[PDB]
């Protein structure tokens, strides 16, 4: 008959919105969020939302920006108690190196000495220490790298850099939606959606050109990008298998220290015991060979058949983006990935045991590529061994060719937000709106 306005409250309707999510962790000193975080839900509840086709868009996901800002802020807070090395910027005369040497790139290791300050304002002390070539620039007389651009802070020796899984949880009135659909490319409608109070834990792993210790694709290698036609964009590749990599530093370095001023001390590399050798990483050849074949097959689906796919090392740019960054034992390594990407594919096999890559060590680093800031890592005593799994790749189109039967890819990197996206693409945040109206016929007495 006559339809009337009715009011309902508690109606299950939501709208897209951004809100701050709060971190939680199962985790004693560490640079990571564990100090800011609260205890986790050990078994987060998941409720499937049936008959829901909610759209996801990882490229517009603001959770990425929140994660990035929190990680940087935490990194900085961990350094505020730590020792400043301003007195360290000195003449640094160097005398080459003497030992039982199998060496490295020639001149990679340097023996240097200087006048360092002491506990009393009235006195100075003569010291010597070893430096890597990357740490020192010639003015013989030398200058510590970046003394002419920034202050250098020593990382605290007692604080771990080991990744800690971080969970993110919604505030009341908000919910986190998760896409369960297999082989999702990160955009468009998701066929299967569920609601969780919190995300699965995400580790703050930092690496370049290759993604380490991330999640694996459930069935097949997944290739995604913001704009497949734009050569500028990075292409993220998620593997459905791990590839194990064995990295080591054989040199048996020793550690010595000097008290500087009343409140602080400086740590430096001492004499090296035994033969001096190049740092390196071992990747299984058979495993890598299979892995590339899986990636190539998926590339062909996107770029079509009848294409010759070639891989190559980066053509240029700084060490920070042209090599693979690691953090193992607190030492920072830069490894040359050439030989992993050195191939051409035609017949679903290459046209042509293990692969060993050379690595370099640098003590002066800038993790977020910020201008005017730098950190000095302390030396780690003894031999380092580190084994990890490669879980994905960052590739860019180099040739971009449409005028030929060929295409060439090279490793990408330098933008950390793309690492965060490899885990966060699954999630979306929405706001709950409980109020609504309907026509149902009814009346109310006055």
């Amino acid at each position, epitope marked *: 008959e006559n339809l009337w306005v009715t009011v309902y409250y508690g109606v299950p309707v939501w709208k897209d919105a951004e809100t701050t999510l709060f971190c939680a962790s199962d985790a004693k000193h560490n640079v990571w969020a564990t100090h800011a975080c609260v205890p986790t839900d050990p078994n987060p509840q998941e409720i499937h939302l049936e008959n829901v086709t909610e759209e996801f868009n990882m490229w517009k996901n603001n959770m990425v920006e929140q994660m990035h800002e929190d990680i940087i802020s935490l990194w900085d807070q961990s350094l505020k108690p730590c020792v400043k090395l301003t007195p360290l910027c000195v003449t640094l005369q160097c005398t080459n190196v003497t030992n039982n040497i199998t060496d490295d790139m020639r001149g990679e290791l340097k023996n240097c000495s200087f006048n360092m300050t002491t506990e009393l304002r009235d006195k100075k002390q003569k010291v010597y220490s070893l430096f890597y070539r990357l740490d020192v620039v010639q003015i013989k007389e030398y200058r510590l790298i970046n003394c002419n651009t920034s202050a250098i802070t020593q990382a605290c020796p007692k604080v771990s850099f080991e990744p800690i899984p971080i969970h993110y949880c919604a505030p009341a009135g908000f919910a986190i939606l998760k896409c369960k659909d297999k082989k999702f490319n990160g955009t468009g409608p998701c066929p299967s959606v569920s609601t969780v109070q919190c995300t699965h834990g995400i580790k703050p792993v930092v690496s370049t050109q290759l993604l380490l210790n991330g999640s694996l694709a459930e069935e097949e290698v997944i290739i995604r990008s913001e704009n497949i036609t734009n050569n500028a964009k990075n292409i993220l590749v998620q593997l459905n298998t791990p590839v194990q990599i064995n990295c080591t530093r054989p040199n048996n370095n020793t550690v010595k220290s000097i008290r500087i001023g009343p409140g602080q001390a400086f740590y430096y590399t001492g004499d090296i015991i035994g033969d001096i050798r190049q740092a390196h990483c071992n990747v299984s050849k058979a495993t890598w060979n299979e892995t590339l074949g899986k990636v190539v097959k998926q590339l062909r689906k996107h770029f079509g058949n009848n294409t010759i796919i070639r891989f190559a090392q980066s053509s240029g740019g700084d060490l920070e983006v042209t090599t693979h960054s690691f953090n193992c034992g607190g030492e920072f390594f830069y490894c040359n990935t050439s030989g992993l990407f050195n191939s051409t594919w*035609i017949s679903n096999t290459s046209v042509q045991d293990s692969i060993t890559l050379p690595c370099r060590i640098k003590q002066i680093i800038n993790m977020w590529q910020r201008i005017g800031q730098a950190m000095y890592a302390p030396p780690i005593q003894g031999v380092i061994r580190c084994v990890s799994n490669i879980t994905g790749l960052i590739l860019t189109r180099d040739g971009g060719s449409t005028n030929s039967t060929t295409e060439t890819f090279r490793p990408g990197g330098g933008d950390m937000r793309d690492n965060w996206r490899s885990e966060l693409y699954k999630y979306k945040v929405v706001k709950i709106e409980p109020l609504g109206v309907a026509p149902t016929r009814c009346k109310r007495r006055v």
Partner: antibody
Framework: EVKLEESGGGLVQAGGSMKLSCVAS????????MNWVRQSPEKGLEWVAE??????????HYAESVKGRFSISRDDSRSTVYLQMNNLRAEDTGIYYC?????????????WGQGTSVTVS | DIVLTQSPASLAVSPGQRATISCRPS??????????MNWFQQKPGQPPKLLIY???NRGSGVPARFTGSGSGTDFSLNIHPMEEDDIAMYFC?????????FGGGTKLEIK
């Protein structure tokens, strides 16, 4: 079993226009490159057009002998390929074929449709 | 454009004898150490069929009697034994560059 079916052929007055079509079957069109060729006993085989996939921004290429009078386009949602032509010349008379590049890195016309006659006068 | 020369215009071959057809690209088909010449067979009323790819690899369903040969700018097709079933036009193709080009369409017949 891959099949290609041509249609839209027939006699057209010179200076006129027509559209040829090819229906893909047995394979995913969106995952594959497509090509057109033509034949006449006077000339033998001649390549006329190629069309690329989305990452390639659907770029197209033409033989100089047909460029600017011919256009190639595809509809991935209907599994079809079209060859549009205008400003037709008697020189364009021949048998047109829908083709597929086949073997990888060894581009070759592994599959052909039956083709269709086109006559211009 | 790359010019693909093919000869003879035609040849008659007696049954059981070897046929030979040659092609001379103005620029080599070779790339990545691999030849890019294709060979096709055609009979009246039918579309061309691929016999050889990469100037040496027989296609699916192709009998042993057909073989490719050569490198650089000098390639040839050798058919043996010749049979009536092999009567056809034969074409070379250069797949290395756009535009793709075709050969002379040499006629092979029984003598």
């Amino acid at each position: 079993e891959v099949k290609l079916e041509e249609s839209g052929g027939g006699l057209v007055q010179a200076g006129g226009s027509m559209k040829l079509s090819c229906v893909a079957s047995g394979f995913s069109l969106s995952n594959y490159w497509m090509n057109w060729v033509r034949q006449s006993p006077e000339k033998g085989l001649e390549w006329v057009a190629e069309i690329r996939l989305k990452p390639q921004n659907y770029a197209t290429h033409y033989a100089e002998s047909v460029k600017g009078r011919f256009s190639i386009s595809r509809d991935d949602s209907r599994s079809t390929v079209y060859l549009q032509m205008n400003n037709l010349r008697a020189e364009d008379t021949g048998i047109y074929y829908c083709t597929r590049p086949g073997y990888y890195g060894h581009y070759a016309m592994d599959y052909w449709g039956q083709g269709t006659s086109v006559t211009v006068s | 454009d790359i010019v693909l020369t093919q000869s003879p215009a035609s040849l008659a071959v007696s049954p059981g004898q070897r046929a030979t057809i040659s092609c001379r690209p103005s620029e080599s088909v070779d790339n990545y150490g691999i030849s890019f010449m294709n060979w096709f067979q055609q009979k009246p009323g039918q579309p061309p069929k691929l016999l050889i790819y990469a100037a040496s690899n027989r296609g699916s369903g192709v009998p042993a009697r057909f073989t490719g040969s050569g490198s650089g700018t000098d390639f040839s097709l050798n058919i043996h034994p010749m049979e009536e079933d092999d009567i056809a036009m034969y074409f070379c193709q250069q797949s290395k560059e756009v535009p793709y080009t075709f050969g002379g369409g040499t006629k092979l017949e029984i003598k």
